[PDB]
């Protein structure tokens, strides 16, 4: 939830965090989710601020209005982001990785945003089971399986949670073909 507050004169729609503090001269104009649930990408903070400004009034930002008096001129409004960014996973795990026994698969992720302390934790699901076993050790952004065997195949998932609790997730399937035992 991102709380937007808009000012009448400087046309500054400060997009603060949910538990923020509306600055002087600005009035609360609404609240929207940046990581929109049904469409995570393809939507940007700029889109959230617009729809909130499509219900206000040009005469006065409070006392909401509509199309003939709404604030549609997005060119004049300046969006001064003062809130934490998304935990965008720039490079996610490969969807499927193919290897032979004795090989080595180095799974990687790069995270940008959130609060300063980023926590990395990995998880492993058995190749036919349904419960997610917790990978011991790890606690890093790159898992390296060496001399991988036919027992270590399956689905490996990493979950990057920050100091706030906005976790982004990514999964990878590791199919290591081998002669049957």
């Amino acid at each position: 939830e991102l709380k937007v507050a808009f000012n009448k004169d400087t046309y500054v729609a400060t997009v603060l965090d949910a538990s923020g503090s509306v600055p002087s001269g600005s009035v609360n104009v609404g609240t929207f989710f940046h990581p929109d649930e049904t469409y995570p990408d393809s939507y940007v903070i700029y889109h959230g601020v617009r729809e909130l400004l499509y219900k206000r009034s040009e005469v006065d930002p409070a006392q909401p209005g509509f199309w003939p008096e709404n604030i549609t001129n997005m060119q004049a409004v300046t969006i001064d982001n003062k809130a934490t960014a998304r935990l965008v996973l720039n490079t996610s795990l490969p969807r499927v990785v193919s290897t032979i026994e004795g090989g080595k698969v180095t799974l990687s992720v790069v995270a940008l945003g959130g609060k300063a302390p980023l926590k990395y934790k990995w998880e492993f699901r058995a190749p036919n089971a349904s419960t997610w076993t917790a990978v011991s050790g790890q606690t890093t952004a790159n898992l390296v399986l060496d001399n991988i065997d036919a027992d270590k195949a399956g689905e490996y998932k990493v979950t990057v949670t920050d100091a706030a609790g906005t976790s982004v997730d990514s999964t990878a399937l590791v199919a290591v073909g081998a002669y049957p035992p």
Partner: protein, 50 residues
């Protein structure tokens, strides 16, 4: 029915959307009625079987 379609590209791309990634096909019309003789329009109200 008047229907206006603006395909994405160099048609629906203003300073509020410089890339042109949005279209629409609004269809609007006008309708009105004039009951010259309402006494000749009868209804009957009754329940229906399940």
């Amino acid at each position: 029915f008047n229907v206006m379609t603006k395909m994405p590209g160099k048609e629906t791309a203003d300073r509020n959307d410089p890339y042109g990634e949005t279209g629409f096909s609004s269809i609007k019309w006008y309708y009105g009625i004039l009951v010259k003789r309402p006494e000749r329009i009868a209804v009957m109200k009754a329940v229906a079987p399940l």
